[PDB]
Design a protein around this ligand. Structure first.
Ligand SMILES: O=S(=O)(c1ccccc1)N(CC(F)(F)F)c1ccc(C(O)(C(F)(F)F)C(F)(F)F)cc1
Length: 232
C-alpha cells in the first residue's frame, strides 16, 4: 500500500497540476512572411507553457527553499522536457496532432511550414505516439514532472545533494505506485526511466533546432532566448 506520506505528496502534485499571434490563414507554405508568423505563433504558445511550468514548480514542496540560482538552473533544464511530456499527454492519436488547447492542434506539416526540420519534428511526434503504450495516469505524470524538475545533474546546479534528496521521495512513490497499480507489469518503472532519457535526447535536438532557426534569421523572444539560445 502507499504510505500516508506518499499519498500526501502525490495528492499535492496532482492538485498543483490542476492549479497569441494567429496562424496565417491560407498563406503559401513557401511564404517567408508566413513562415515567420507560424514561428511567432509557436513561440507565444511556448511562453504560456513556461509560465505554467514555473508556477507548478513553485508549488512543489522544497523547490522554493532551494537557492535562487538552483531554482533557475532546474527550470532552464526541465522546461522543454516538461513541455514534451505534456505534449505527449495531450497528443491526438486519431488525427496525429499535438494538441495545445481545443482548436489549437498542429500536425507535422504545420511545424514544417513554420521552418522546423523533420529531424526535430519526426522525433517529437514519435515520442508522443509512443507515450500512449505506457498509459500513465494523472498521479504518474505529476510524479514524473516532479522527478524531472529535481534532477541534480543539470547544468549549473550548486546544491545537487539537496536536489537529489528532494527527488528521492518522488522516485520512491512512483515505483511504489506502478507496483501497486500494475503488479504484473515489471517493465513499467524502467519504461518510465526510458522516457526520462528520451526527454534528454529531445531536449538536445530542440536546442539544435533553435540554433538552426537562428541561422535562418529566426530569433526567439527574450524569455525563450534566455532559456534556449546557445551563446559562446
Ligand atoms: O509542444 S511544444 O512545446 C509546443 C510549443 C508551441 C506550440 C505547440 C507545442 N513544442 C513541441 C515539443 F514537442 F517539443 F514539445 C515546441 C517547443 C518549442 C519550440 C521552439 O523552441 C519554439 F521556438 F517554437 F518555441 C522551436 F520551434 F524553436 F523549436 C517548438 C515546439
Amino acid at each position: 500500500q502507499l504510505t500516508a506520506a506518499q499519498e500526501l505528496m502525490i495528492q499535492q502534485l496532482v492538485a498543483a497540476q490542476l492549479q497569441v499571434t494567429p496562424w496565417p490563414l491560407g498563406a503559401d507554405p513557401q511564404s517567408r512572411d508566413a513562415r515567420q508568423q507560424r514561428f511567432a505563433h509557436f513561440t507565444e504558445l511556448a511562453i504560456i507553457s513556461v509560465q505554467e511550468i514555473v508556477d507548478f514548480a513553485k508549488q512543489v514542496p522544497g523547490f522554493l527553499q532551494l537557492g535562487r540560482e538552483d531554482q533557475i538552473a532546474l527550470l532552464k533544464a526541465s522546461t522543454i522536457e516538461i513541455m514534451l511530456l505534456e505534449t505527449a499527454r495531450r497528443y491526438n492519436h486519431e488525427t496525429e496532432c499535438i494538441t495545445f488547447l481545443k482548436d489549437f492542434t498542429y500536425s507535422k506539416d504545420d511545424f514544417h511550414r513554420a521552418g522546423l526540420q523533420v529531424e526535430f519534428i519526426n522525433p517529437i511526434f514519435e515520442f508522443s505516439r509512443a507515450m500512449r503504450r505506457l498509459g500513465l495516469d494523472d498521479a504518474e505524470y505529476a510524479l514524473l514532472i516532479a522527478i524531472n524538475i529535481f534532477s541534480a545533474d543539470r547544468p549549473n546546479v550548486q546544491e545537487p545533494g539537496r536536489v537529489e534528496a528532494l527527488q528521492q521521495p518522488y522516485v520512491e512513490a512512483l515505483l511504489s505506485y506502478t507496483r501497486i497499480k500494475r503488479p504484473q507489469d515489471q517493465l513499467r518503472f524502467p519504461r518510465m526511466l526510458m522516457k526520462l532519457v528520451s526527454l534528454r535526447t529531445l531536449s538536445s535536438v530542440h536546442s539544435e533546432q533553435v540554433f538552426a532557426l537562428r541561422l535562418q534569421d529566426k530569433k526567439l523572444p527574450p524569455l525563450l532566448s534566455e532559456i534556449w539560445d546557445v551563446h559562446e
